[PDB]
């Protein structure tokens, strides 16, 4: 499961 995503996503 990555989780990268959320984070990458979670910045702007």
């Known amino acids: ?3 990268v ?3 990458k ?3 702007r």
Do not use: A, V
Request: proline residues 0%.
């Open 1 to 3: 499961k990555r989780i």
């Open 5 to 7: 995503q959320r984070i």
């Open 9 to 11: 996503d979670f910045l």
